[PDB]
Nucleic acid binder design. Structure first.
Ligand SMILES: Nc1ncnc2c1ncn2[C@H]1C[C@H](O)[C@@H](COP(=O)(O)NP(=O)(O)OP(=O)(O)O)O1
Ligand SMILES: [Mg+2]
Ligand SMILES: [Mg+2]
Length: 430
DNA sequence: TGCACTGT
DNA sequence: ATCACAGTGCG
């Protein structure tokens, strides 16, 4: 009677299907419905792949592949390459396309921009509004034309995917308690209806397709989204969690894909998320800390309270470039010119941001990597950002890293710099 | 504050 | 020779 079940919210996670590919496919119809990928640069092995159409994924093409190697799996692979500006890749087209989608989503509910192509949605309020709009009318299956119900169909009493989807949807609806407006299952269902409408508005108004997950928290919504990609949405009810987690690898839950998740596996000697239920909260806290332990004890039961943050804009605006192998920057003149290229794109983006969103960045973060450093960043320094001036930002950034040159020869730079990073942070209203 | 960690 | 980003938590 007093055991909480984590069914107080309706949360959704929307994620664009092969987003960068869709952006290029909208612009160039010749790429539509083909095996294609978006590539970065072209000189080193045809460029690095950062996005792959589902037609190409069937040949085994993946993100991070070199295009020359992808061509070995998919000889007819088509390629759109990222725009290059001031010597570097420039992602403006995709950031702007992202804004298109985010603004549409914001018409239905407050969203948390989680990445360039996905956003969390708190639908608890909209669900209640819709629950009263209908005078206890049953939810027709025609309002959920692309929804999957995780765990269904099941039980006693065809062999195509869409047939299965309908089967599971019918079982779900036929047992829904439509008279109880407080039923969590009914609230998820209404949430799914709204997400159907949200995804329809996105495709109508931008041409982009997406998938979504609907559940009671962000981790389940995220996990649900990926169960039936692309162009489908999945509803993960509280009751579906025991079976879903019983065979769910720990690394699949958000925040457990790295070192922490591996230590959970190595220390506890378990494989699946569900196995965590057999440990006490104090046990999990003793191994992984007070916060992580409490989070794991609740999460393996499908409970999580991370709120959907009202944040439609990114908190930072950054610009970087790697200088691999022999292209490392070994002269103060080289560092001077590239710091200026970055500063110029940053000024461009910062001026636009200030005009569009009534805010100004107040701190400039400068980071570099040094050739041979095992880590991806070696130094991070911040300085005041008093003016949107590329030459000042680039001059200041040089000043804050300058002390890092171990070459008495003023013109030389050692060790060579393999990365430059400028980031505008600490925004204030303007 | 600077970095490790986690993610797209 | 992945690369270009972006958010969170620790001491
Ligand atoms: N490591 C990386 N480097 C550069 N760009 C990247 C990247 N990872 C992602 N992007 C860019 C490229 C992506 O288009 C976009 C969204 O990332 P996802 O949602 O993780 N992958 P997608 O949406 O393409 O396919 P689907 O969602 O259907 O699985 O961010
Ligand atoms: Mg995506
Ligand atoms: Mg995504």
């Amino acid at each position: 009677p007093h055991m909480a079940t984590g069914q107080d919210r309706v949360v959704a996670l929307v994620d664009m299907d092969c987003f960068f590919v869709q952006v290029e496919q909208r612009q160039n119809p010749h790429l539509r419905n083909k095996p294609c990928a978006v590539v970065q640069y072209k000189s080193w092995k045809g460029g690095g792949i950062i996005a792959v159409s589902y037609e190409a994924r069937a040949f085994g093409v993946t993100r991070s592949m070199w295009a020359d190697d992808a061509k070995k799996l998919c000889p007819d692979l088509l390629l759109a390459q990222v725009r290059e500006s001031r010597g570097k890749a420039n992602l403006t087209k995709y950031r702007e396309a992202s804004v298109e989608v985010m603004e549409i989503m914001s018409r239905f509910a407050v969203i948390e921009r989680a990445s360039i192509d996905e956003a969390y949605v708190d639908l608890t309020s909209a669900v209640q509004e819709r629950l009263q709009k209908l005078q206890g009318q049953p939810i027709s299956a025609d309002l959920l034309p692309s929804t999957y119900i995780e765990g269904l169909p099941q039980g006693p009493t065809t062999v195509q995917k869409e047939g299965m989807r309908k089967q599971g949807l019918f079982q779900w609806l036929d047992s829904l308690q439509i008279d109880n407006l407080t039923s969590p299952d009914l609230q998820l269902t209404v949430g799914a209806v709204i997400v159907e409408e949200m995804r329809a508005a996105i495709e109508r108004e931008t041409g982009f397709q997406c998938s979504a997950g609907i559940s009671h928290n962000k981790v389940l919504a995220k996990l649900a989204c990926g169960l039936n990609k692309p162009n489908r949405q999945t509803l993960v009810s509280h009751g579906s969690v025991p079976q879903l987690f019983s065979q769910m690898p720990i690394r699949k839950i958000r925040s457990l894909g790295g070192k922490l998740g591996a230590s959970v596996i190595e220390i506890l000697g378990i494989e699946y998320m569900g196995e965590l239920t057999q440990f006490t909260e104090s046990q999990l806290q003793s191994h992984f800390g007070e916060k992580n332990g409490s989070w794991l004890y609740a999460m393996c039961r499908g409970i999580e309270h991370d709120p959907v943050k009202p944040r439609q804009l990114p908190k930072t605006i950054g610009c970087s470039k790697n200088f691999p192998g022999k292209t490392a920057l070994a002269t103060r003149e080289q560092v001077q010119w590239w710091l200026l290229q970055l500063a110029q794109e940053l000024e461009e983006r910062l001026t636009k941001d200030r005009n569009d969103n009534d805010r100004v960045a107040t701190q400039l973060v400068v980071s570099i990597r040094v050739q041979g450093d095992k880590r991806l960043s070696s130094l991070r320094r911040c300085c005041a950002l008093t003016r949107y001036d590329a030459h000042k930002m680039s001059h200041d950034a040089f000043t804050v890293i300058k002390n890092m040159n171990t070459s008495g020869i003023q013109t030389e730079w050692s060790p060579p710099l393999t990365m430059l990073f400028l980031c505008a942070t600490k925004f204030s209203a303007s």
